[PDB]
Each structure stands twice: as C-alpha cells, then as structure tokens.
C-alpha cells in the first residue's frame, strides 16, 4: 500500500525534526540570505579571535577539539533518531549497538552537508560560518581534515534533497544488514526493505523530474564509506604527532572498529 509507505515517511520526517535542532531548511535559509539569521564569518585568525566575543591551547587543536565535542552531540541526536525507527529497538541489543557504531559517522557527514556550500561551513548552530579556506590553512596535519568533506558536500548538495528525503535516507543507512559483527541479519534487512520502499516512493513523489534520483542517491553511500576510512587514517596520524591531544571516550569506542 502506497498509504502505508507514505505513513512511515511522515513518521520519520516527524522524528527527524524532533531529533535535530538544525534542519537543512534552516541551514539553507541562513546561507541563502532569507537579516536576523546572519552569521559572523571566520576566515582568518583575527576573526576567529573575535568570534568568541559573540559566538559560542592551540588554534588548530582548539578547532579540531571543537569538531570532536560537536560529533559527540551528533551521536546523541542520531541515537535518539534511531530509537524512533520502527523495529530498531526490538532488535538484539548487541546489533542495536553495532549499527550505531558503523552508521554514526556516515550520517554525520551526510547531514554535515546540509551545513556547507562550496566556500564554507556553518558552525555553532548556525550562529557562525567558518570559511573553507581558513580550515585548509590549518597547520599540518590538520590542514586537510575537512577538504574531502567539502568535496562530498558540493557533489551531494547537487542532488537538491530536502529534510523529508534525508530523514528516510539516514534511516536506510542505520539499518544496514551488512555491518561487521551482526548477529541477526534477516530482521535488519527486512526493516531496510521497508525503508528503501518508503524512500523510493518519497523521491518519486517529491522529485518527479529528477530521473533515477533513487539510484543516484544510493550510489552516494560509496562516497560516504570512502570518506570515513580516510578519516580513520588521519586520526591515526594525529594520535602519533599529538600525544598531548585527548579524544572523547564515546568517539573512541566507535573507532575501535
Ligand atoms: C568540524 C567537524 C568535523 C567532523 C569530523 O570529521 C570529526 C568527527 C570525528 O569523530 O572525528 C566542525 C563542522 C561543522 C561545524 C558545526 C558546528 C561547530 C562545531 C565545530 C566547529 C568549530 C568551532 C565551533 C564551536
């Protein structure tokens, strides 16, 4: 039934809104130019220095540790969104964990897109905007830790997806039956079918002229996994050249792999 699938979509979009403070709708309103939502822009050290005057150790390390604590917040939000996914809580508690462990970052970078444009990314809930050039000018080896993200975004953002489409897509990602260490794959794969079903209808109804967007979008999951692995490697270098740099526990458990 179309109606059954449309219902599940409605249900998801709804949980999505309740779980994420900064939707793409808002993110775009702020980047577009739609006077009371205008961000302070950080493009150099001095602006950075001035940012803390109104926006919410070392400069590169202070920024990196900023992303850390921020993703830890993202994990808590996605984890809450997961629970609302019909069937996810009924799954084995161990696989409930495994899925989150492998789906967390893929999702963070998908939604991180909503906050970017070719020349920069929104920070602190949209209060600010840090340019892509500044981050790139970060002392090695922190200079290129956002570069491959920006490339993903410009490509992904090109699909023109809105919040309702994403809610189902990040749902499809979490319920991936091909995760390392899954005990019961069958139950997980049946939920995803439903999700893929929902998504497929969603895109067709929401993007009538965008041919094979369903397939186009699904292919992006390759770019996402690509990005994660590149990150893990970088992280390995960091921990060696920066033995005096700590990592948030939650973020370390997820990385043990
Ligand atoms: C940087 C986030 C990068 C995500 C990442 O790869 C690290 C995650 C991990 O597990 O290692 C920030 C991206 C967007 C900014 C959004 C909000 C502001 C948070 C940090 C930005 C720096 C200072 C602002 C407080």
UniProtKB/Swiss-Prot annotation:
<dbReference type="GO" id="GO:1903845">
    <property type="term" value="P:negative regulation of cellular response to transforming growth factor beta stimulus"/>
</dbReference>
<dbReference type="GO" id="GO:0045944">
    <property type="term" value="P:positive regulation of transcription by RNA polymerase II"/>
</dbReference>
<dbReference type="GO" id="GO:0070888">
    <property type="term" value="F:E-box binding"/>
</dbReference>
<dbReference type="GO" id="GO:1902894">
    <property type="term" value="P:negative regulation of miRNA transcription"/>
</dbReference>
<dbReference type="GO" id="GO:0000976">
    <property type="term" value="F:transcription cis-regulatory region binding"/>
</dbReference>
<feature type="cross-link" description="Glycyl lysine isopeptide (Lys-Gly) (interchain with G-Cter in ubiquitin)">
    <location>
        <position position="18"/>
    </location>
</feature>
<dbReference type="GO" id="GO:0003682">
    <property type="term" value="F:chromatin binding"/>
</dbReference>
<comment type="function">
    <text>Nuclear receptor that binds peroxisome proliferators such as hypolipidemic drugs and fatty acids. Once activated by a ligand, the nuclear receptor binds to DNA specific PPAR response elements (PPRE) and modulates the transcription of its target genes, such as acyl-CoA oxidase. It therefore controls the peroxisomal beta-oxidation pathway of fatty acids. Key regulator of adipocyte differentiation and glucose homeostasis. ARF6 acts as a key regulator of the tissue-specific adipocyte P2 (aP2) enhancer.</text>
</comment>
<dbReference type="GO" id="GO:0051393">
    <property type="term" value="F:alpha-actinin binding"/>
</dbReference>
<dbReference type="GO" id="GO:0000978">
    <property type="term" value="F:RNA polymerase II cis-regulatory region sequence-specific DNA binding"/>
</dbReference>
<dbReference type="GO" id="GO:0042752">
    <property type="term" value="P:regulation of circadian rhythm"/>
</dbReference>
<dbReference type="GO" id="GO:0060392">
    <property type="term" value="P:negative regulation of SMAD protein signal transduction"/>
</dbReference>
<feature type="binding site">
    <location>
        <position position="231"/>
    </location>
    <ligand>
        <name>rosiglitazone</name>
    </ligand>
</feature>
<dbReference type="GO" id="GO:0045892">
    <property type="term" value="P:negative regulation of DNA-templated transcription"/>
</dbReference>
<feature type="domain" description="NR LBD">
    <location>
        <begin position="4"/>
        <end position="257"/>
    </location>
</feature>
<dbReference type="GO" id="GO:0010888">
    <property type="term" value="P:negative regulation of lipid storage"/>
</dbReference>
<dbReference type="GO" id="GO:0003700">
    <property type="term" value="F:DNA-binding transcription factor activity"/>
</dbReference>
<dbReference type="GO" id="GO:0001227">
    <property type="term" value="F:DNA-binding transcription repressor activity, RNA polymerase II-specific"/>
</dbReference>
<dbReference type="GO" id="GO:0005634">
    <property type="term" value="C:nucleus"/>
</dbReference>
<dbReference type="GO" id="GO:0000981">
    <property type="term" value="F:DNA-binding transcription factor activity, RNA polymerase II-specific"/>
</dbReference>
<dbReference type="GO" id="GO:0043231">
    <property type="term" value="C:intracellular membrane-bounded organelle"/>
</dbReference>
<dbReference type="GO" id="GO:0010887">
    <property type="term" value="P:negative regulation of cholesterol storage"/>
</dbReference>
<keyword id="KW-0539">Nucleus</keyword>
<dbReference type="GO" id="GO:0070165">
    <property type="term" value="P:positive regulation of adiponectin secretion"/>
</dbReference>
<dbReference type="GO" id="GO:0004955">
    <property type="term" value="F:prostaglandin receptor activity"/>
</dbReference>
<dbReference type="GO" id="GO:0035357">
    <property type="term" value="P:peroxisome proliferator activated receptor signaling pathway"/>
</dbReference>
<dbReference type="GO" id="GO:0001221">
    <property type="term" value="F:transcription coregulator binding"/>
</dbReference>
<keyword id="KW-0225">Disease variant</keyword>
<dbReference type="GO" id="GO:0030855">
    <property type="term" value="P:epithelial cell differentiation"/>
</dbReference>
<keyword id="KW-0325">Glycoprotein</keyword>
<dbReference type="GO" id="GO:0030154">
    <property type="term" value="P:cell differentiation"/>
</dbReference>
<dbReference type="GO" id="GO:0005829">
    <property type="term" value="C:cytosol"/>
</dbReference>
<keyword id="KW-0863">Zinc-finger</keyword>
<dbReference type="GO" id="GO:0070412">
    <property type="term" value="F:R-SMAD binding"/>
</dbReference>
<dbReference type="GO" id="GO:0010629">
    <property type="term" value="P:negative regulation of gene expression"/>
</dbReference>
<dbReference type="GO" id="GO:0097677">
    <property type="term" value="F:STAT family protein binding"/>
</dbReference>
<dbReference type="GO" id="GO:0043537">
    <property type="term" value="P:negative regulation of blood vessel endothelial cell migration"/>
</dbReference>
<dbReference type="GO" id="GO:0007584">
    <property type="term" value="P:response to nutrient"/>
</dbReference>
<keyword id="KW-0832">Ubl conjugation</keyword>
<dbReference type="GO" id="GO:0008217">
    <property type="term" value="P:regulation of blood pressure"/>
</dbReference>
<dbReference type="GO" id="GO:0042593">
    <property type="term" value="P:glucose homeostasis"/>
</dbReference>
<dbReference type="GO" id="GO:0015909">
    <property type="term" value="P:long-chain fatty acid transport"/>
</dbReference>
């Amino acid at each position: 039934e179309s109606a059954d699938l449309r219902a599940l979509a409605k249900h998801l979009y709804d949980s999505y809104i309740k779980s994420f403070p900064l939707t793409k709708a808002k993110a775009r309103a702020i980047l577009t130019g739609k006077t009371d939502k205008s961000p302070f822009v950080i493009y150099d050290m001095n602006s950075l220095m001035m940012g803390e005057d109104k926006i919410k150790k070392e400069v590169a390390i202070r920024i990196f540790q900023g992303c850390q604590f921020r993703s830890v917040e993202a994990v808590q939000e996605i984890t809450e969104y997961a629970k609302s996914i019909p069937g996810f809580v009924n799954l084995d508690l161990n696989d409930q964990v495994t899925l989150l462990k492998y789906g967390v970052h893929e999702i963070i970078y998908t939604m991180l897109a909503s906050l970017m444009n070719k020349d920069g990314v929104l920070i602190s809930e949209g209060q600010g905007f840090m340019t892509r050039e500044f981050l790139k000018s970060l002392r090695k080896p922190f200079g290129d830790f956002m570069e491959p993200k920006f490339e993903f975004a410009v490509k992904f953002n090109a699909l023109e997806l809105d919040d309702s489409d994403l809610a189902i897509f990040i749902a499809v990602i979490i319920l991936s039956g091909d995760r390392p260490g899954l005990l019961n794959v069958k139950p997980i794969e049946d939920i995803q079918d439903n999700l893929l079903q929902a998504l497929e209808l969603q895109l067709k109804l929401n993007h009538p002229e965008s041919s094979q967007l369903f397939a186009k979008l699904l292919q992006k999951m390759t770019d996402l996994r690509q990005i994660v692995t590149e990150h893990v490697q970088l992280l390995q270098v960091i921990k060696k050249t920066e033995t005096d740099m700590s990592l948030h526990p939650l973020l370390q458990e997820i990385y043990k792999d």
